[PDB]
């Protein structure tokens, strides 16, 4: 059985805290050391800062140590030790290390064994790293070791180059042996024996931690409570209350992160980061259910909660059809999408069990249709739909058009100087539209009525994503590899949230939906329409029907 | 290199063709002789190991256990030098045990076939019995053990 | 200036975008191509250095797929004389840096292998070629030479990245910068003021440091300059290429300036490196080079001439053999050494790993040779050259 | 050939001074080649210098040898150069943007020397517009076109 329903990828090593009944692992994709209970209830990033390529993990949960070890083979390779709660982080070994691939612990002797796949040695050192000895060095037996094991006085290591597990003595490496001869990829090795795990008293057995209890080297309790991502620890230190602050949902290729809106916090853990996606372009969130909707190839929409749970395929191309960009109506429970193949704007019903999708606006040959929509945004309260179209050579011009959320009364708000028009976002509070023009390298602003068009930000290379929250405009530039925040009024005070982030994409602030303005035609008249309800300006709801059916 | 590979030893005249070592040998290569210590060193590409033995062959110690197609071999000082066909480089190890297995050269472009030592200094000098009137030989002379050993042309029957 | 005559360009920057090597004028209003572009099949120019006096433009080609493409070549600005300077011994990762000592006519390059790097030197227009340094833990990639100060600076972006300064023979290695540097992709030397500028695309920082450590100041930084890949210093300005922005910027070399950079060209893809081709940046007068001993007749050295700081006499090394008592001639080494037969050649190796100069120059032989035996008496090495499968020969 | 002259995509020939103006696709620049004489000399007149007055992606180029004016059509680039119908002297100096806007998928541009008017085809709008050489009097001449490619003006006919 699989421990985690979500796809936690690039788990280079796994360490089991048998005393605390917790699981520790290192995520190479996120470059973080994450810890969770053995079942998987609460996964939390334990160490994130100053960590590039964490490979190799080790635990000493015995009551007197409660220590953690890991090895990094990236910039400035080293082996670090920290208490199993994440505190007291020190670099025990940082010299004569190039590629510290392997790492193990000899619990009785208090010696940790590690290997280098480049310098080709097998040394061990005390917990503080003061005393260091070499077992195997300057030997062709060790060519590309990966993992290590220590049963009694025998050390077993797997070499990926020689494709053979080998055994020798753990003090001088004399009794060399070949346990296995041909393994396609030996990689990790573990010695399954009760002696390998010394039993000890578990302080967490009687802890009052609400979500997670982790052993700590610091006394007197020798344990501490930990909060899952998006949660804040109460001063009582035993109960964790859920945080409610908004955060930037920064979408990149192959990963989606949650970045706290405060520029001071440089930790990408405002939520459980989605991993394993392919060509992520845009994202939408269901605040009420704490869901995150994103689209990945081929034209398929997936959803997961903010805590990395229930990650499924909400709607497939087989039933719903292809979709590229999203815009979620949180009032009427309708998900508006842009179809890349058909070059049209559609709507999908989240409410209920059966998924109904219909095409609202299609390329009808006039200048008021959809030529090649890139960004779409919705205003459920006012029943207006705003989208950005790059246009086509057939006659449809690059435009920022508007329409009612039933697909009627289309009009061209803005046009001209919209070369390489990117996604467009809507500020509901001020009824203004923010869009990014890559060709001009600017972020313009205009009213929802096609008036007061102004250039908010100048001198951009390839702006991709735009999000407006409170009085700040958050945008991302792919070529600059930067996420920047400016005042939405004038775009003057520029603050770099993140930098040197490759393959940036669109983003949206995970703000709390305004509960006051949480009613429209469909919300007030639920179940009136048989299949699809669409709000229209003035509080009137227009019933529509899915593909293949017609309204009676 | 025939089946049941043998380290066949004889005199310079080939008086006593006695195989020194015949077991545990597939493709012997890079025979070397520890002149200072009177020992026999060799490598085997199929076995991928470097072993030493007495001149008679009573003793047999595997100096180097891990190797990749070790083909050449030579010995000098307290170090033993060999070449690998796979990594295409020259290594070095302590002749007594092999502790200091390091690489003497980078990844050579081609495969190093044979490695030898140039003893510019005094080599294994030994008075030649063949010096005195061809060592009492009307024909070719071969200075074997305990005096010279005369040799004859192979083309003719002698 | 007569508005009728034509003369070749004397001052321009040579940009080394991977597909082709092109030159541009420093005057922004001038759009002419200052050199015949170097393009063709298998053109992957990692770095470019120029010998102004001889009028040559060197570059290092790298190709993982094809081994024959990995070479160090040179060509005159008019695109006339193209010849492969270095084609043998190039490692798996290829040549990763070129520094041309115009004063002594020595070409320094960092041969890169799978697990080790060689900082080799080649005397131009000759066959002498010596591996000055062989390192494994460090990863010297881009190299720049300062003959006037008799120093050799390179950049390392491997584990424990740093910028190292060493003498012209790579002896007195000192780490100029060890902190605040991650990927020093590109290095340049200001000849006039004795500064070592560098660009770090990982930290998005353009910084300079004097040759003797001391002042380390940031010229440009921030969200902008996302990926500077190569820098060069001319007069009071630094010209650097940015891969992401596809522009060849130019700004004042002095720090604390805030004027926006001037763009020389735009929309150019796969920018790698830039260098300045001018007689000013490569002086050759004896007073200009602080009386460099290797200026004349290669300092009288038979094989290689290196000017060390303080030592007015030209230190001489040997590409092969050993330096004799005369100090300017190289003869065969008199110490015992190894001889090993490669497939097409017979070579030699000293017993001491530190000494990299071969006891004698490599002798190329027939298709295959499988043994070596040397007869000192006759000073000859017997070898069983197996010319073909069936054609054996002693 | 590309070996001597270099790559070229579109042509515009000066029949008075015997110079052939070309558009370089790879370099994204406007060049000139000397037909007169035996040796072919080519130089780059206008190149993408990063300003809005350079050449982003030139598609059509026409020349007026008598008045010494060069007119070209550029589809622009995302770097900042806008889709424009620009003009310059035939030596590469004094560039200016005659027309801009509504030039999506701008095709080749031809010059009517007799009337000093420019005719260009905008595929995106599917029209063939007309304007003066001084950036004035921009009018739509033909409507309802799918993908107009070539334009030639002779006498009173288009
Ligand atoms: C290696 O050999 C090449 C080819 O002989 C040398 O290139 C030559 O370098 C000399 C000195 O710089 C050049 O002389 C100069 O010619 C220009 C006109 O072309 C003149 O204005 C200068 O005053 C000077 O007389 C020579 O032209 C040039 N020839 C070629 C084919 O490039 C190179 O210098 C030699 N380098 C070494 C390390 O010896
Ligand atoms: C990371 O490194 C920086 C620079 O040395 C240091 O200021 C910071 O405290 C370090 N943080 C951690 C978690 O090691
Ligand atoms: C193991 O190594 C020790 C020390 O070298 C040696 O005495 C012993 O004989 C060896 N035993 C085996 C099984 O190799
Ligand atoms: C060997 O060959 C040489 C040269 O032909 C000849 O002088 C000599 O007599 C031969 N035999 C001996 C015993 O050297
Ligand atoms: C070599 O470098 C050291 C500093 O590491 C310096 O003190 C010494 O003077 C240098 N060599 C000379 C010129 O003696």
Curated annotation (Swiss-Prot), chain A:
Glycosylation positions? 50, 175, 310
Q: In which tissues is it expressed?
A: Expressed in first and third trimester cytotrophoblasts in the placenta (at protein level). Absorptive epithelia, including renal proximal tubules.
Q: Where in the cell is it found?
A: Apical cell membrane; Endosome lumen; Membrane, Coated pit; Cell projection, Dendrite
- Mapped LDL-receptor class B repeat ranges: 21-63, 66-109, 110-154, 155-195, 290-332, 333-382, 383-430, 431-472, 473-513
Self-association state and partner proteins as the record states: Binds plasminogen, extracellular matrix components, plasminogen activator-plasminogen activator inhibitor type I complex, apolipoprotein E-enriched beta-VLDL, lipoprotein lipase, lactoferrin, CLU/clusterin and calcium. Forms a multimeric complex together with LRPAP1. Interacts (via PxLPxI/L motif) with ANKRA2 (via ankyrin repeats). Interacts with LRP2BP. Interacts (via NPXY motif) with DAB2; the interaction is not affected by tyrosine phosphorylation of the NPXY motif. Interacts with MB. Interacts with BMP4.
Q: Which disease is it linked to?
A: Donnai-Barrow syndrome: An autosomal recessive syndrome characterized by complete or partial agenesis of the corpus callosum, congenital diaphragmatic hernia, facial dysmorphology, ocular anomalies, sensorineural hearing loss, developmental delay, and proteinuria. There is variability in the expression of some features, such as diaphragmatic hernia, corpus callosum anomalies and proteinuria.
The protein, known as: Low-density lipoprotein receptor-related protein 2
